[PDB]
């Protein structure tokens, strides 16, 4: 699509905007056939807003948290999918971080989309239930019938269920990187992003 000729926040909010336009039906090829969804033209110009060294390494990091969400039923989050979607298309590369964060290249420096919550260049709210980038109306999305209640959010981070807030009786937050650490089954606090210590779960069954 032409959204390259008007440059970049073109591409971002025709992104998003393209996004849940199509929903209904990418829905669901991101459970029936993902790697096609990833495969798509209407997302080669957000790919080319991504630094072209770790593009695809995010995208490695995202597909593996999308088959997590696939693999949990129960969490199923429609903002937390249609934010990450784009980052999906490059195509992936084993990395071992847990990205908090991705960069899209916007003036000669770029923004940072969260992996957790929001962003100016991605905003949702949820009792009101409209998307928001760059201060632009991208559309509104509908949810879906099994959206996830449980607190539980399984796309966050890359063998782990974060499954609510700062649980005191767990111990005084962990960093991230203390996570390798933990064993299946095993719970924490991480100290997420923000100021924000959630409790988390290592998970007790493998990735794929």
């Given at each position: 699509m032409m959204w390259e000729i008007n440059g970049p926040e073109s591409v971002l909010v025709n992104t998003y905007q393209w996004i849940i336009r199509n929903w209904e039906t990418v829905k669901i090829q991101w459970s029936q056939n993902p790697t096609m969804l990833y495969n798509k033209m209407e997302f080669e110009p957000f790919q080319s807003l991504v630094p072209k060294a770790i593009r695809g390494q995010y995208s490695g990091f995202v597909r593996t948290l999308f088959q997590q969400m696939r693999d949990v039923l129960?969490?199923?989050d429609t903002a937390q999918i249609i934010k990450l979607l784009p980052f999906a298309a490059a195509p992936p590369k084993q990395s071992r971080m847990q990205f908090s964060?991705?960069?899209?290249?916007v003036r000669g420096?770029?923004?940072?989309?969260?992996?957790?919550?929001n962003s100016p260049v991605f905003n949702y709210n949820?009792?009101?239930?409209?998307?928001t980038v760059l201060g632009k109306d991208a559309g509104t999305l509908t949810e879906d019938?099994?959206?996830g209640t449980a607190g539980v959010e399984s796309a966050v981070?890359?063998?782990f269920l974060i499954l609510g807030k700062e649980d005191?009786?767990?111990g005084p937050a962990l960093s991230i990187n203390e996570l390798s650490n933990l064993?299946?089954?095993?719970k924490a606090n991480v100290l997420i992003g923000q100021g924000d210590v959630v409790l988390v779960m290592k998970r007790k069954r493998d990735s794929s």
């Open positions: 129960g969490t199923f964060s991705f960069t899209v290249n420096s770029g923004m940072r989309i969260l992996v957790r919550g949820k009792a009101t239930k409209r998307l019938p099994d959206e981070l890359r063998g005191k009786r767990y064993a299946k089954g095993e």
